[PDB]
């Protein structure tokens, strides 16, 4: 009831979070899938009505939504911001994640690692509206805004600010007094630069780290491979092949065999489209989450504990990836605590003093006030504290003597 542990040191940390944003846009010619363009089957398929048209309408809804997702995630920026020639961001690295001029598509080094580690029977695949090169310009724009101008490019035009002062801001946003940055700038820059360096090794070590993106690539290949394999199925018909039936059984009997192949192939196609509608809803839930983390973690700083990497959130950098996005969340983690005696308030002369910000502690021999998230003791004073009533009502108050910095000047 009188013990508090305060962190005397901390670590900047960089946590890599990976999110799917879009599926491979797909549209299927249901007549070329079912009938193979062989007219005797098409003249049966016409008798089923809207089961021809509405599957292309449903897959067109899915295909357009992949562009809408990718637009909402990356195109949050009002202008294509680009980085100055000078790179003196207070020592903080910014090279492995900014564009590389040697890369043909102007991707960053870490974007190239991600683009390496992730890997027609009436079916058609459609291109994305934004190419990988265009997405790599948006992830450069969001990054060059974030480096040169803080959160301000999310509120209006980008307002430049020196990068050490933007970090001083972002420390001041997590209840650490900004002097803790400036007094440690070289150490904080080294912890950050080292933490970026470990991302390249981490992403190099195993493809199993990118499981969320490798999954959305695998499941669409697995669905289409199964949709193609279902052409090789009888559904009660004499043969799995249409022009074979039309050569053997005479038109009267042929029709009953073909109507099974139509029913079976169509039920397989409705099963595939239904599964893609559900998978597209799961990917949209991920794309809305990614569109939220662009707004809150990149374009801002978030108070939401464990929404934006573990520890207190400082900032994040987006990097593009095949069918998705990767955030490098930068977080402050407190790391080397000591135990201290503490009391909720102190007594001066007949008055209870409470700390204005921070908390009271003692090393066992002296009483100090410290900020809550980093041990930095200050002598307890009439500006560091405020009074609220007599020396009784509080439970566990201690006796002390508060220094009043005006009284030595009133010696004049």
């Amino acid at each position: 009831n009188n013990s508090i542990a305060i962190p005397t040191n901390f670590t900047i940390s960089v946590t890599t979070e990976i999110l799917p944003v879009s599926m491979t846009k797909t549209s299927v010619d249901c007549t070329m899938y079912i009938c193979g363009d062989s007219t005797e089957c098409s003249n049966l398929l016409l008798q089923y009505g809207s089961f021809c048209t509405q599957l292309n309408r449903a897959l067109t809804g899915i295909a357009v939504e992949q562009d809408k997702n990718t637009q909402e995630v990356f195109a949050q920026v009002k202008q294509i911001y680009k980085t100055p020639p000078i790179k003196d961001f207070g020592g903080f690295n910014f090279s492995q994640i900014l564009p590389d001029p040697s890369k043909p598509s102007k991707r960053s080094f870490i974007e190239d690692l991600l683009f390496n580690k992730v890997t027609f029977n009436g079916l058609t695949v459609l291109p994305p509206l934004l190419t990988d090169e265009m997405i790599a310009q948006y992830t450069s724009a969001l990054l060059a805004g974030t480096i040169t101008s803080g959160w301000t490019f999310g509120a209006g035009a980008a307002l430049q600010i020196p990068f050490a002062m933007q970090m001083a801001y972002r420390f001041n946003g997590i209840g650490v007094t900004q002097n803790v940055l400036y007094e440690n700038q070289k150490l904080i820059a080294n912890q950050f630069n080292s933490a970026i360096g470990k991302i390249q090794d981490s992403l190099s070590s195993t493809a199993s780290a990118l499981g969320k993106l490798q999954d959305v690539v695998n499941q669409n290949a697995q669905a289409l491979n199964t949709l193609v394999k279902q052409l090789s199925s009888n559904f009660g018909a004499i043969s799995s092949v249409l022009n074979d039936i039309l050569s053997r059984l005479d038109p009267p009997e042929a029709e009953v065999q073909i109507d099974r192949l139509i029913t079976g192939r169509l039920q397989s196609l409705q099963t595939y489209v239904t599964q893609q509608l559900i998978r597209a809803a799961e990917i949209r839930a991920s794309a809305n989450l990614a569109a939220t983390k662009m707004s809150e973690c990149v374009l801002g700083q978030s108070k939401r504990v464990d929404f934006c990497g573990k520890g207190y959130h400082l900032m994040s950098f987006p990097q593009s990836a095949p069918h998705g996005v990767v955030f490098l969340h930068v977080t402050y983690v407190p790391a080397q605590e000591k135990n201290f005696t503490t009391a909720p308030a102190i007594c001066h002369d007949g008055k209870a003093h409470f700390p204005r910000e921070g908390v009271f502690v003692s090393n066992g021999t002296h009483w100090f006030v410290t900020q809550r998230n980093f041990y930095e003791p200050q002598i307890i004073t009439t500006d560091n504290t405020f009074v609220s009533g007599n020396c009784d009502v509080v439970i566990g108050i201690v006796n002390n003597t508060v220094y009043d910095p005006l009284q030595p000047e009133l010696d004049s």
């Binding site: 680009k82 980085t83 100055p84 000078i86 994305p128 101008s149």
Partner: protein, 67 residues
């Protein structure tokens, strides 16, 4: 007319990454996405009039004056 995924050999005429695009005029200059096509191409009715097709501009470029 866009022929999705075709080479023009198989069909003004313009080859895009999305397909052989017919009746539109290719323009090098870049503009907003007015009508989407695919693989960064977009089309519009900018003026003396025909449909044009061009690589879309993602926004006005701006080098922030940081020091």
């Amino acid at each position: 007319v866009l022929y999705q995924g075709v080479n023009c050999t198989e069909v003004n005429v313009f080859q895009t990454r999305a397909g052989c695009l017919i009746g539109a005029e290719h323009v090098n200059n870049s503009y907003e996405c007015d009508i989407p096509i695919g693989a960064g191409i977009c089309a519009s009715y900018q003026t003396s009039q025909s449909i044009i097709a061009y690589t879309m501009s993602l926004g006005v470029e701006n080098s922030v004056a940081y020091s």
